[PDB]
Symmetry: D2
Subunit: 315 residues, 4 copies
């Protein structure tokens, strides 16, 4: 079953969140890459991504995807070259080169991931639909819109018009700010009487202090982000709210690890009809008392850093 088939039938598709983030974190060896893909699959991901040999990358993904109920998706991000002034025919040529690797490896679908400029997001979708494969487009923007002042609603409209059947947001903000952005996008599609499936790949980092440029501008980016990491409970709340908003492609970006994906899969186990592939016996009474979801759902966890602030100023 393909990605549009699943989603058209109202299924909840779970992404393989921060694959790249995790490979980075682990210090990367096909075995290392195959093992990570497997952890995401075991956690419940229905998508195994590959990027940009590029062919071995695609092979390993396909290999693990065949071990469960998952698809292989090829992703492309913004060229770093747009800031390099050079953009246009040059941009589509790069996308085109990557499109070939993917068609050649016969991926299940494509994702225009990481894009801060709608204009460039569009060029990507235009090039990608020429494969005849389903295309998903996400924008690395918050409620205020992209780098040109293009609002989320309008960005959503233009991406669908360009041919994306799945739109959403990713990689710049935490789950809460990301879903607010997706709500804006959803309202853009409604007002324009257009339809598309929605997806969200938020950061697993809390970013209440970020400005419109996202977490990259926080002073802790990228080596002091540990304190902000979402617990599994934070992610279950995100999964539930995403589900309630109409999001059906629920994933994650930087900060996401297999256990965050498993939390999504477990939170939505009822709705999905299945679970992805002993605290109550602990010796201490007060520890046993924590073996109840309600306890964690209501606990305001401490940071453990009394000498540090709870927020920082961007820049």
């Amino acid at each position: 079953k393909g990605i549009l088939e699943r989603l058209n039938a109202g299924e909840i598709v779970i992404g393989d969140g921060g694959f790249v983030f995790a490979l980075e974190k682990r210090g990367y060896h096909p075995e290392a890459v195959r093992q990570l893909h497997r952890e995401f699959l075991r956690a419940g991901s229905n998508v195994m991504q590959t990027f940009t040999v590029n062919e071995a990358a695609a092979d390993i993904a396909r290999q693990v995807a065949d071990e469960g109920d998952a698809l292989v998706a090829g992703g492309v991000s913004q060229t770093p070259s747009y800031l390099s002034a050079k953009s246009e025919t040059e941009v589509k040529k790069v996308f085109l080169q990557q499109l070939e690797v993917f068609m050649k490896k016969n991926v299940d679908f494509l994702i225009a991931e990481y894009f801060e400029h709608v204009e460039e997001a569009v060029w990507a979708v235009e090039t990608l639909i020429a494969s005849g494969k389903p295309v998903a487009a996400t924008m690395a923007i918050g409620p205020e819109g992209d780098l040109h002042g293009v609002p989320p609603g309008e960005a959503a409209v233009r991406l669908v018009k360009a041919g994306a059947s799945i739109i959403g947001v990713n990689c710049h903000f935490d789950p809460t700010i990301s879903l607010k952005t997706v709500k804006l996008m959803k309202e853009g599609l409604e007002a324009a009487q257009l339809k598309a499936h929605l997806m969200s790949q938020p950061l697993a980092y809390h970013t209440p202090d970020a400005n419109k440029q996202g977490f990259i501008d926080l002073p802790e980016f990228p080596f002091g982000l540990e304190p902000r990491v979402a617990t599994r409970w934070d992610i279950q709340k995100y999964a539930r709210e995403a589900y309630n908003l109409g999001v059906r492609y629920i994933g994650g970006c930087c900060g996401f690890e297999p256990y965050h994906i498993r939390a999504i899969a477990e939170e939505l186990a009822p709705e999905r009809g299945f679970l992805p592939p002993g605290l109550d016996m602990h010796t201490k009474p007060w520890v046993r008392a924590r073996a109840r979801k309600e306890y964690w759902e209501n606990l305001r966890i401490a940071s453990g850093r009394p000498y540090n602030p709870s927020m920082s100023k961007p820049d």
Copy 2:
């Protein structure tokens, strides 16, 4: 080089801190276990631990240790029998039991790991040395001592007298509180004219709010600990302080992942002699950045239950 030859040759032994926590976190598949081991070895760990299939765990650990400059260590922790009050010979029997397997698999050394009672740790040391292999003993206690009131200085002295060639602290507090405990253990050994290598396997979780029982009593244990996780800069400061205090077997316990081990190897790359296998590009910015929690609606500390 054996564990003791390394240490006597002035080398820094990097532990594979967090092994069990990582597998638990990744959700566990010999390949899954083999990969995790490789990550630690690749991060610079000189020890691949193995516990209690048993023959398999020991075999995978040995295979990855073979792949690099690492030893395999057999770990033993506090037993239910002792807490369930069977004491004496009875407790010595389960360790002997465990030893057997580590004997047959021929592990390089043994660690009496995770003991909240000095007494039971001693009984563990006395049993493990019957293996003729070097024995390391670590206590899950803080500056205030073990569960019967035995202070760190004394605990260190009884562990060495019992035959441990390496002693220290592990798994109950963050790096700073753990090293203060180690300092107390070291002053004890000195006041007693005793000598032994020191080790530390602290939590990678900041724990300023814990009482003498350790992080377990904190209400966030074990599923709400994320905010407390040490950054690599916190870990590098820990490695540096540990080295300066005289610690030469530097590892970690719950919360330590491979990247934390790697921070230790890089920090101490000059003292070791090699590395393990825009203004934010400067290490001193990170060493001085008071990172934010990102959780303004949450407290900074909790009271232990």
Copy 3:
């Protein structure tokens, strides 16, 4: 010098910010009222406010104002009648009512203080100018505007058109959010070719967690606000920013005590020309010290109810 002569002569008018909050805090005795007034005048305030016995309040204020370089001002705030939906002529009547007393006691000027609705503020301005005395109008709104959605730029324009010689913001947010609102009010007046003196009477409580309704909706209002209190360094930064933005009637509202007013006078002593009546000895240490809350078990922000 009258309020308007002072301002046109380039002077900085220091308000007696916090008067009601202080008396409320001290628990209220004409002597008690007279002393509080003296504290503000002694801290540098150039205005002694009076509201609504009435003749007494006005008399005590005048006596202390007489003692120094201060004016007496009659304050009027949003009425229940307007919120209780009587609007139009009815609301104008209670202000006229209030004016009467301030007319007989001969106060120096009038302030339409504390209005969450531009419309009712205008009706207040239109009534108060019938006194022939200068009228100041301040809004209890933030950057997002009043309760009907009227933005700061527009609110400022309608208040001046209505006859207010002085406009600004008061009592709903901390100094920074209040001055951002003032900046918006100033851009409105500019886009409309209008001119008027500006004033600010912010809360002395830090309020980063409030929504458009102001600090009242925070769960700590009104008895758990202590941690939020501005230090004198926070107040000096506010005075300096207010001056730089062009504000010349600089006061405060809830939370401001005499020492906060004094911080304003000292900060601006060079721009005024006089003062009001071991490495911690340096002002730049205080200007840079990120003070601790002393409440590690409490959050740093709360969600408005």
Copy 4:
């Protein structure tokens, strides 16, 4: 009724906390001093203090004390001259000079306040009892003892032996650390089979981060302490716990204002049989919901400073 009479009958005596702190805060004029004394009396204080003309100071205190149920107490603090090496006969001469002003003005009792060295605290009590007036002694020390390593228990013992009928702690730590110190003192008196009334004049500032030197060593001392100020609820909890510990002279030191004293008086209004000399009608429902002691007693108030830490390192 005198101070020993009240306390011997088991009455709860309420101090006039941070009189000096408050006068400082207000920028100081007999009228200013009389008004402050009155606010404390109106708040419930049974003691009006005067210090070190000194005579006018004593007159005003007496004057206001006569307006209610209060006594006038003369207080003496450590000489700053002990750090000036000069100490002994020199110290008692200063105390003696002050003792005369007070006997001359006929105060009701005397307080050896602010003392960081037990040795010097003792000299003060020795000089002061020579007036035939009741003497109270407090130490500015925490659980670890004074500047010489003299523990609280022993300090308590020596002060009583020197002639103090009332002992306690003050001016260096918050209510919680101060009462722990008083508990230690109380245990010292018990073990030595001695008896004395207990008193506490803690800071109204939370100081969980202070070292044995007290709040003077925190970096915010003395101009950045605002965030630490106790709410009236924090003080009611202190009053109740002080009462439960056996403390019967309940006061305060730096940071205390009349409203903190009133909170003590109200918390203990039942036990005392009287109160010292409209939120529920507020327009907003959620505001009306706060007119219940339980709400405040259970509310973990926010600091309002997300960009600041919750604790600082001493020094």
